[PDB]
Amino acid sequence: GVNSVAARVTELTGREVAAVAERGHSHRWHLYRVELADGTPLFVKALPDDAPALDGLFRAEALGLDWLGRSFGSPVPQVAGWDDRTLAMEWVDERPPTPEAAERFGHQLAAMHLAGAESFGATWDGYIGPLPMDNTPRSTWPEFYAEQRILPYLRRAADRGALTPGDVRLVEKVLDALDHLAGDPEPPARIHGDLWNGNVLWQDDGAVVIDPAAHGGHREADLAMLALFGLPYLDRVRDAYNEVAPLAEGWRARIPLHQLHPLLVHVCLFGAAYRTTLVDTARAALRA
Ligand SMILES: [Cl-]
Ligand SMILES: [Cl-]
């Protein structure tokens, strides 16, 4: 990988780079394993030299990692350095999932969430992949979720013709019922914001969470995302989580509600594949 990657990392971290290896791509940026002179490995995301880039994209992740990472036994990687083009962080060597790690990860996530937030949203502009994500601070969840987590992606998907007017009306029924469906107000959590299995890197003693879309959110969101695409030892993670920060009564029934945001993002980003799941989940939320 780039001699330009190596240069940028040294500038940002102050550390000498001994090696760079390519590790593929995600959306609009390239991935690398970068090794420092003492053997320390770093995971590095980098936009190409000269390429135009989304306003505040890398910032959202750098700031989100810093903010999310201030809990005991944090599962969040440490950032070695960043700028609008480059993000260098701790390299994780994955391990197979184990039930022991799963229990420990449950505790890690509970402490992460319960660090708490002043409001829903965040002080920096958000992204979910390459899509804008509205982090405007809000004091109440139903309004935040409807206006900043559901409606923007619903309208976008409808505009692109991935969702029908009937699909839109179905999701709008949920929103109209939201101040019953929501359950009871609780404080905003520090949530990862995109916590599906591919963003969980298993370790011997827990797990590391990567690629956050971090903000003040409902903690049920992260657990619902683990459920949506599944996770090794999901029930052990949730059981251990519930030991230390028990979810509010009726959380299982609310899982579909909390899956509507990610599902709308998927329909936006990836198309029709996820439409029927969105519809089925909306129906399920309505009858929850
Ligand atoms: Cl070094
Ligand atoms: Cl399990």
DSSP 8-state secondary structure symbol assigned to residue 120 = B
Q: Minimal CA–CA distance to 105: which of 205, 191, 192, 197?
A: 205
Among all bound ligands, the one having the nearest atom to the CA of 19 is: 1
User: How far is the C-alpha of 108 from the C-alpha of 94, rounded, in Å?
Assistant: 17
Q: Alpha helices of the chain — where are they, by DSSP H?
A: 3-13, 57-68, 99-114, 141-144, 151-159, 165-176, 178-181, 219-228, 234-244, 255-270, 275-286
Report CA Rg, the chain: 19
Question: What is the whole-number distance in angstroms between the Cα of residue 234 and the centre of ligand 2?
Answer: 5
Distance 226 CA to ligand 2 centre (A): 13
Rounded CA separation 87/96 (Å): 26
Ligand 2 center to residue 100 CA distance, Å?
10
CATH architecture of the domain formed by 123-185+251-288: Up-down Bundle (1.20)
What is the DSSP track for 123-188? Answer: SS-EEETTEEE----BS-HHHHIIIIIIHHHHHHHHHTTSS-HHHHHHHHHHHHTHHHHT-S--PP
Structure tokens at 1: 């990988």
CATH 3.30.200.20: does it fit domain 1-91?
Answer: yes
Q: Which residues surround ligand 1, an ion (CB under 5 A)?
A: 15, 36-38
Q: Return d(Cα 79, Cα 6) in angstroms, integer.
A: 16
Side chain identity at 129, as an amino acid letter?
G
CA of 46 to the centre of ligand 1 (A): 20
Angle (CA) 53-27-69 rounded to 5° is: 85
Distance CA 288, CA 199 (A): 28
- Tokens, residue 113: 């969430």
Task: Using the CB atoms, write b or e for 7-37: b if 16+ within 10 Å.
Answer: ebbbebbebebeebeebeeeeebbebbbbbe
Q: Which residues are catalytic?
A: 194
Q: State the Cα–Cα distance between residues 80 and 82, nearest whole angstrom.
A: 7
Record the resolution, in angstroms: 1.9
Q: Is 129 within 8 Å of 221 (Cβ atoms)?
A: no
Q: How was this structure determined?
A: X-ray
CATH superfamily of 92-122+186-250: Transferase(Phosphotransferase) domain 1 (1.10.510.10)
Tokens of 77: 């990687």
Residue whose C-alpha is closest to residue 145's, from 101, 175, 173: 175
The encoded tokens of residue 231 equal 């996770």
Domain boundaries, the chain: 1-91, 92-122+186-250, 123-185+251-288
Sign of CA dihedral 63, 68, 74, 76: negative
Q: What's the 182 CA to ligand 2 centre distance in angstroms? A: 27
CB 46 within 8 A of CB 74: no
Cα 41-45-87 angle, rounded to 5 deg: 80
Q: Which ligand is nearest to the CA of 9?
A: 1
Burial per residue of 173-192, b for 16 or more beta-carbon CB atoms within 10 angstroms, e otherwise: ebbeebeebbbeeeebbbbb
* 271: DSSP letter: -
Cα of 185 to ligand 2 centre, how many Å? 29
Give the whole-angstrom CA distance, residue 143 versus residue 165: 22
* Closest ligand to residue 230's CA: 2
Ligand nearest to the CA of 18: 1
* Helix, strand, or coil (residue 118): coil
236's tokens: 């052990």
| Residue 57 alpha carbon to ligand 1 centre in Å | 28
